[PDB]
Design a protein around this ligand. Structure first.
Ligand SMILES: Nc1ncnc2c1ncn2[C@@H]1O[C@H](COP(=O)(O)OP(=O)(O)OP(=O)(O)O)[C@@H](O)[C@H]1O
Ligand SMILES: Nc1ncnc2c1ncn2[C@@H]1O[C@H](COP(=O)(O)OP(=O)(O)O)[C@@H](O)[C@H]1O
Ligand SMILES: Nc1ncnc2c1ncn2[C@@H]1O[C@H](COP(=O)(O)OP(=O)(O)O)[C@@H](O)[C@H]1O
Ligand SMILES: [Mg+2]
Ligand SMILES: [Mg+2]
Ligand SMILES: [Mg+2]
Lengths: 480, 53, 59, 179, 502, 478, 70
């Protein structure tokens, strides 16, 4: 803090800070600017030394709003990257990019801090056990089953249900999980930041009576924040999840939502930094900035981190660079389709385009694997036939082709499920479905025992038994 | 129709009332501009005594 | 709404008169200054101005 | 500001500062500015077409009559080698601003219709100094017909920060009434 | 109109009580002026976003603070500005004089009235870029914001503190939907702002006239930046509207703000940044175009009960090119908002007006934004319609389809006929409940589709007149109680019998 | 004692003019480069100050050919923007960008001149009377009715018939109109301008003798003109039209062919200026340039401008920046299609893409409105059907679908109309169809009383009576 | 406006103008950012030659330019 530099430029969020010639901050140090507010009271806006520019000035991207900053103000270099408080006193608090508590409660204890920039675990460390965990979602458990300790991705465009799916997952897994969870919202609506925090209170995860008996830590870098801030709540929320992994040695959930905002935030300031634009307007360092962020989120022998992270896909285009880079990292990708959303099938998880590494018969058993494989062949056939049936009608199909179409149509509806979170969207109370119920339920449809049922007995029911009951009710209604 | 046409005529009457009122106000404003000249002169002297120390 | 027109009118006219009037006063003031004591009053004002500046600096 | 013209001038000042020729170098730099004013002299150095070898010989003769400082003669030779003689004028002007920074002097420029005695200036130059934060103040004077009877001083990094009272009171009154 | 006799008192008043305070003021020199932008030398004390005033009298905004000069974005056209003239640093950063007296006034992007009805009385001031409400500062959206559009208030509900986008093609009906909403808040005690960014001057005037005829101008502010004005003003027009809305929002009032279009804002901000030589992105939009909207639309919130429980519902409007939702600006504004309303010209030409494509329309708040009586009735209505379309499209591919499907094509075609509405024929929430109750429970499964539009209209009138108790239950208890349901049933049967007779 | 400047640079039509340091011409003032050629000495090069560059140097866009200018010529600031003669003298005359007569007649009176860069009418001065306006065209009077005193847009690519449709509008509307019409040709064929000029003389709009009673002005910056001259022809034409409304307090028609060219000229000059190009090659200030020209056209309480302006749409792409920006300004768009011109339906007005603001039941009455929807509901349904019919063909359709298709086909043909201008192509005489006749004809087709008639009975007839009479001949002939 | 005019370098140049010298041994970092260092000096390096900075990082001189080596 003995180094003082004067701001030279403010162009948007990107500052250029001229320092004394020998002593310049390293890259990724936090500058903290002695700026003043509208009251005149000194206000501090943190910056990150992104790059050394020569002529004894750095180029830093400010973590707060640069409106009100003046060329020539004092900038002190803190001599380290952004230290975020970690540990026990971060649990059930809601946090900034900078680690400052944001829930109007008394200040977080800062005896323990940790820098947000660190290297990933070495290749020796990585923990290789393959373990599946139950989520309660019929499309997920059957077809793209999630890996305990593995990176999980929710791919979809705007409005398909990445967020609702994340909420449902959070609710099931979060309460059940022994280990501390961490939600880090990188660039999302503040309404959804509020709707989580008051619903984490209602489920008892925040535990507002006795804080620090809580089991979650919320970090928020929402859409109103500058692009310097949305680049770095991916790292702040990750720094806190690395502490519960590495030091406390307990398994962590890390729900990131959204990962694209983090990628997008860098792109916004990338042009300002002088970097030439890469394909599709992103920064040239996209595959490194994901890798740096992604590599850190991995399970180690000391502890295991399970991260489920929502990924925006711009204009439903899975070839976009931001989405494309992410796919390599994940252990199981859950690709939400707008086609199933507009048909009403919720969650609109595309069963043919969602893959998982764990869906292998050594991992999931040969009973589950054959039914998960035969469901996709029935849906694949139906997809191929869609072009033909519209043009040539249903009657040009063989009995075999018609049977699959009838089955695929029934199967497609069955995958849909009412959630606990989407009771305001569905109108019907949500249902939790085990892995066993799903396999048992899917097997019957595939078997054909349920060929006589109408198709609407399958839409938005949890168990197979519920579908049969719904069919009985529908028949009763029809008689009247 | 008949009520509707009557209403339309009423609207025209209102416009005539409103058109006339604005004209009357304009004439009054012109007279005022002509009137209260002393304020103008003295008004001019007005600033002078307070404009400077 | 037509009455609101007049309300505004009464304001514009007022402002105009105020200004024009002020403008004249300004003219007269200028004239008098052009005739007011060159080295005597000019000097006095200079000193005053200087004094004012000094005061400002102190604050 | 950090542009190529500024960058070179700053280097020239830094070498003078090291060797304690800041007064000695500054005189030479002022001496250069008179030299490069002339359209014909500046054009000869600036244009690409005239051979570089010829330029050095002429430059050496110019240096001898001028009697410039040993680094200052180098600095122009460095400019010529590295093609930046097209921006000598910007560089020379830039040096003056840098030279004040090194000393800690600050220019102020004070404006009146009527020439004023040193005593008023002494107060202003002391006044700009405390308000400036200056080590030293150097005062620049100009004569203006337009104001009234006051003046305005300009100071700061640039001539950015101007605090005045002469015309401005009249303007303020004009605004004030309209409120 | 007598002016001259008081001028000698009036002129003296101006000189009277004048402080003439002397303070240090930042000043600088104009290097360049061209096409909306100045490059200012000097001004080493300005702050990023400070208003700087030119010698002629123009207020500009210092966006780029480069190390040599300052990029100033003129709020107007600097025809008058001359190279070498001196510009002052004001100190303020784009405030707005805001008060209670803006209601019913068409106002400029800088907030000075442009209807010619007199100067506004404004005591306080608010910033243009004020920070959004925090995460702890808000509360969940629960109150309804009624549009009177049965297709919106049943399936895409809009709640106070929400941000619903209205997206469609040119001439798809987007303005009409937004305007209808403002006209419909006649006695709901909310304040409405209509920001018109970059919209034709005649068109803005037409909207204002329409509001005035209805009497809606008693609570509406119209902020208008026409196409002719400088890009800066268009770029700042939405912010001015938000600041006005925010002022009411913090006084515990409920506000609704319509921004028409947000697409013409980001064109006006693309123009500003391309002339500042900022490096562009997709379609030459700046990098920070997403941030420009996002920071604006996150102002719209429902405050907590600690901060007065006021709200601010934003209604962006972003028109897409020939159904291209894949374009760069409509991509950015969809993902900000709390659900979109797609309007489509393919449904607009086929009679379905207002042309809400309900399949791609989304309400991210869901049925928390509906009153309970309506939530019970239309809670599963949104999904059923989507499901119904799937087999409407599929039963054109079958020849001999069974009755159990033919029942659903019967009922689903009846449910679509509920949703169509004549322009400016808003429905009370009571009239929406009995309309959705009728269609959902199969009481239209007898009559013809053409008759369905007529039958519902007759039925609603019936229950206004004969049964005012149904009005009383749903307006007070806000719950579709058994007594209310019984009244509705009785009425439905009576109306059906009368209809049969006719 | 106007200040004199020197040319410092000539980069195409963009001049950098250096001035004495105190005195710079303001932005949008005109300059007069003193000029020189081999024979004589013309001051004809006129400029317009766009920027101020610092080091006492403006940048100006020249309104003529810059060939033959030397670096260092004398330039005089005229101290005002480029002023143009307006009024009584501009009736019956063909003008430049610069206001200088072209038609080889006597010089105009420069008594009453006006600057071309004017701020718009303020928001107080506008009017909100919503009146419909008849053009004698079936596609226009029914599905996209035109606004009295508001901007009208004719969209379409090359060769779909914008110029012909405008000529028809000019032919029907101008003689009947009691208000001075002003044509502005921006970036068009000079042959057309010459052709247009003759038509006015033939129809008497431009009477050869006593030319001061002509009641049409003509303003031409054509394809051959340099790009600085095509930017401002629109403004020059607009300035004259605006003066008539403001001072003669009349109702004005302002026909412009083509406003796309005005944007394109602005785009060409922008590249020379060095402004970064925002989208495609378009100038960053596209909305503003378009907006400034468009805003001035609005009708006020003193008069009215009814501008019908054809807009080119490049590569038939309505999502291009130039066409897209224009849509916001217009009160009624008339999007002509190419697919309808390949079939030969003329005017090739795509009846679903064309929209008007006046097609509302309180403006057009309940009768016109309930048909114009029911026409568009049929065509819209037919449009959806085409994907299916393209592969299978007609036979598959249901009986309801087939009935609509038969009706839709008849309806499309009925919209087609012969034009008075188009007699020189086809030879068939044009037909003025009154609005009442058009509404009546459409009701019959929709009703079906005419379901037995063949489809080519409807093609290129004026009334519905004409179709019936035409229908008999096809049947009678055998 | 261009790299290698850092005003250490210009002054170093003025001091040694009346000289001959080959800086080919060592070259001084001009600017570091995003995984790229620009180096002033290194007159003798060849394209693709590994170069190692202080604190041990190793880099490849992919771009050789008159002003500096990327
Ligand atoms: N519910 C409705 N019923 C009938 N007509 C409607 C309805 N809503 C809108 N319209 C009509 O559609 C036309 C175009 O609507 P409007 O201008 O409101 O849409 P827009 O998308 O704002 O178009 P623009 O792009 O021109 O702004 C209007 O004339 C309006 O009357
Ligand atoms: N399981 C579900 N049931 C009903 N509706 C859903 C479900 N999931 C998503 N939706 C609908 O999708 C809307 C938006 O999805 P959201 O969860 O916000 O995803 P994203 O973050 O991708 O926009 C929700 O508000 C809801 O309307
Ligand atoms: N109403 C019409 N009737 C017959 N042919 C037409 C009609 N309109 C246009 N055409 C054909 O289109 C051709 C060119 O149309 P034109 O108006 O020149 O297009 P543009 O406006 O793009 O120049 C004309 O030569 C004519 O043959
Ligand atoms: Mg989300
Ligand atoms: Mg609109
Ligand atoms: Mg043409």
């Amino acid at each position: 803090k003995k180094n003082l530099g004067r701001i030279a430029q403010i162009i948007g969020p990107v500052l250029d800070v001229a320092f004394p010639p020998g002593k310049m901050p390293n890259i990724y140090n936090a500058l903290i600017v002695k700026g003043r507010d509208t009251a005149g009271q000194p206000m501090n806006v943190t910056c990150e030394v992104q790059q050394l520019l020569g002529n004894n000035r750095v180029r830093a991207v400010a973590m707060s709003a640069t409106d009100g900053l003046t060329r020539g103000m004092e900038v002190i270099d803190t001599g380290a990257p952004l230290s975020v408080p970690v540990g026990g006193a971060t649990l059930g608090r809601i946090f900034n990019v900078l680690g400052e508590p944001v829930d109007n409660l008394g200040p977080v204890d800062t005896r323990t801090t940790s820098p947000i920039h660190r290297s990933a675990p070495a290749f020796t460390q990585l923990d290789t056990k393959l373990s599946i965990f139950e989520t309660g979602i019929k499309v997920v458990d059957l077809l793209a089953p999630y890996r305990r300790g593995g990176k999980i991705g929710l791919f979809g465009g705007a409005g398909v249900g990445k967020t609702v799916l994340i909420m449902e997952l959070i609710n099931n897994i979060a309460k059940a999980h022994g280990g501390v969870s961490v939600f880090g919202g990188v660039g999302e609506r503040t309404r959804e930041g509020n709707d989580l925090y008051m619903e984490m209170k209602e489920s008892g995860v925040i535990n507002e009576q006795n804080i620090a008996e809580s089991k979650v830590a919320l970090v928020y870098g929402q859409m109103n924040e500058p692009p310097g801030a949305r680049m770095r709540v991916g790292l702040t929320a990750l720094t806190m999840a690395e502490y519960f992994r590495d030091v406390n040695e307990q398994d962590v959930l890390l729900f990131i939502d959204n990962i694209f905002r983090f990628v997008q935030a860098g792109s916004e300031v990338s042009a300002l930094l002088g970097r030439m634009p890469s394909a599709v307007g992103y920064q040239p360092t996209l595959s490194t900035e994901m890798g740096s962020l992604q590599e850190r989120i991995t399970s180690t022998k000391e502890g295991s981190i399970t991260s489920i992270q929502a990924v925006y896909v711009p204009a439903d285009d899975l070839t976009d660079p931001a989405p494309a880079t992410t796919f390599a990292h994940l252990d199981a990708t859950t690709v939400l389709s707008r086609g199933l959303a507009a048909k009403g099938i919720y969650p609109a998880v595309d069963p043919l385009d969602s893959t998982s590494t764990m869906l292998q018969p050594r991992i999931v058993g040969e009973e589950h694997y054959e039914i998960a494989q035969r469901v996709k062949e029935t849906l694949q056939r139906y997809k191929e036939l869609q072009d033909i049936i519209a043009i040539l009608g249903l009657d040009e199909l063989s009995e075999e082709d018609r049977l699959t179409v009838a089955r695929a149509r029934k199967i497609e509806r069955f995958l849909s499920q009412p959630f606990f979170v989407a009771e305001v969207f569905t109108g019907s109370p949500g249902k939790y479905v085990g892995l066993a119920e799903t396999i048992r339920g899917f097997q019957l449809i595939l078997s054909g025992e349920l060929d006589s049922l109408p198709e609407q007995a399958f839409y938005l029911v949890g168990n197979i038994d519920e579908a049969t009951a719904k069919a009985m009710n529908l028949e009763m209604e029809s008689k009247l | 129709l008949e009520v509707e046409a009557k209403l339309a005529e009423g609207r025209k009457k209102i416009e005539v009332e409103l058109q006339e009122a604005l004209g009357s106000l304009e004439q009054q404003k012109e007279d005022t501009i002509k009137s209260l000249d002393s304020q103008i002169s003295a008004l001019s002297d007005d600033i002078v005594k307070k404009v400077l120390p | 709404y037509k009455n609101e027109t007049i309300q505004f009118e009464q304001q514009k006219a007022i402002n105009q008169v105020r200004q024009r009037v002020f403008q004249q006063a300004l003219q007269g003031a200028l004239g008098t200054l052009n005739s007011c004591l060159n080295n005597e009053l000019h000097l006095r004002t200079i000193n005053a101005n200087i004094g004012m500046f000094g005061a400002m600096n102190e604050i | 500001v950090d542009s190529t013209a500024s960058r070179y001038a700053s280097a020239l000042a830094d070498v003078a500062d090291v060797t304690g020729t800041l007064e000695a170098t500054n005189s030479d730099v002022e001496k250069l500015i008179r030299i490069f004013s002339e359209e014909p002299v500046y054009y000869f150095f600036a244009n690409p077409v005239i051979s570089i070898d010829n330029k050095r010989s002429v430059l050496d003769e110019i240096i001898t009559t001028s009697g410039l400082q040993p680094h200052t003669a180098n600095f122009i030779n460095i400019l010529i080698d590295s093609e930046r003689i097209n921006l000598v004028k910007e560089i020379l002007n830039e040096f003056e601003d840098v030279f004040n920074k090194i000393t800690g002097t600050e220019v102020a420029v004070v404006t009146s219709v009527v020439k004023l005695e040193n005593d008023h200036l002494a107060q202003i130059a002391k006044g700009v100094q405390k308000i400036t934060g200056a080590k030293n103040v150097r005062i620049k004077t100009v004569i203006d017909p337009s104001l009234v009877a006051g003046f305005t001083i300009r100071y700061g990094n640039e001539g950015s920060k101007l605090v005045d009272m002469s015309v401005k009171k009249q303007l303020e009154e004009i605004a004030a009434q309209l409120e | 109109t007598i002016r001259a006799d008081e001028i000698s008192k009036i002129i003296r008043e101006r000189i009277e009580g004048y402080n003439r305070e002397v303070k240090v003021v930042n000043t600088g020199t104009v290097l360049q002026v061209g096409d909306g932008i100045a490059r200012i030398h000097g001004l080493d004390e300005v702050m990023a976003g400070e208003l700087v005033e030119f010698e002629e009298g123009t207020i500009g905004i210092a966006l780029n603070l480069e190390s040599n000069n300052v990029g100033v974005v003129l709020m107007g056209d600097g025809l008058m500005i001359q190279e070498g003239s001196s510009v002052k640093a004001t100190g303020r950063i784009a405030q707005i004089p805001v008060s209670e007296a803006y209601l019913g006034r068409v106002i400029n992007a800088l907030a000075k009235p442009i209807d010619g009805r007199g100067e506004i009385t404004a005591s306080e001031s608010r910033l243009i870029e004020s920070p959004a409400p925090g995460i702890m500062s808000r509360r969940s959206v629960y109150e309804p914001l009624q549009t009177g559009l049965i297709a919106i208030d049943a399936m895409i509900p809009v709640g106070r503190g929400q941000r619903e986008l209205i997206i469609g093609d040119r001439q798809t009906g987007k303005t009409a939907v937004a305007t209808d909403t403002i006209l419909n808040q006649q006695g709901q005690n909310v304040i409405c702002v209509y920001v018109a960014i970059g919209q034709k001057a005649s068109s803005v005037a037409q909207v204002v006239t329409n509001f005035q005829e209805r009497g809606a101008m008693e609570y509406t502010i119209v902020v208008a930046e026409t196409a002719d004005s400088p890009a800066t003003l268009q770029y700042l027009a939405p912010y001015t509207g938000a600041a006005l809305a925010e002022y009411f929002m913090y006084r515990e009032r409920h506000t609704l703000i319509i921004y028409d279009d947000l697409s013409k804002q980001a064109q006006a901000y693309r123009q500003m940044s391309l002339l500042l030589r900022r490096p562009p992105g997709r379609e030459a939009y700046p990098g920070d175009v997403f941030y420009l909207h996002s920071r604006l639309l996150e102002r719209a919130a429902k405050l907590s009960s600690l901060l007065g429980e006021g709200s601010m519902t934003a209604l962006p409007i972003v028109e897409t090119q020939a159904g291209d939702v894949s374009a760069y600006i409509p991509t950015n504004v969809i993902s900000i908002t709390d659900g979109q309303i797609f309007l489509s010209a393919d449904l607009f030409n086929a009679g379905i007006r207002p042309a809400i494509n309900v399949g791609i329309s989304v309400s991210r708040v869901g049925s928390a934004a509906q009153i309970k009586a309506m939530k019970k009735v239309a809670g599963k209505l949104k999904l059923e319609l989507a499901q119904f379309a799937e087999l409407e499209a599929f039963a054109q591919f079958a020849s001999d389809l069974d009755k159990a499907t033919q029942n659903q094509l019967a009922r689903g075609q009846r449910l679509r006929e509920l949703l169509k509405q004549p322009q400016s024929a808003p429905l009370t929430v009571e009239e929406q409940v009995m309309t959705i109750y009728t269609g959902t429970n199969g009481y239209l499964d007898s009559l013809e589709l053409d008759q369905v539009r007529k039958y519902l209209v007759e039925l609603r009138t019936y229950v206004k007149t004969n049964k005012p108790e149904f009005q009383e239950i749903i307006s007070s208890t806000k719950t579709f109680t058994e007594e209310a349901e019984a009244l509705l049933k009785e009425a439905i049967q009576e109306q059906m019998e009368r209809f049969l007779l006719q």
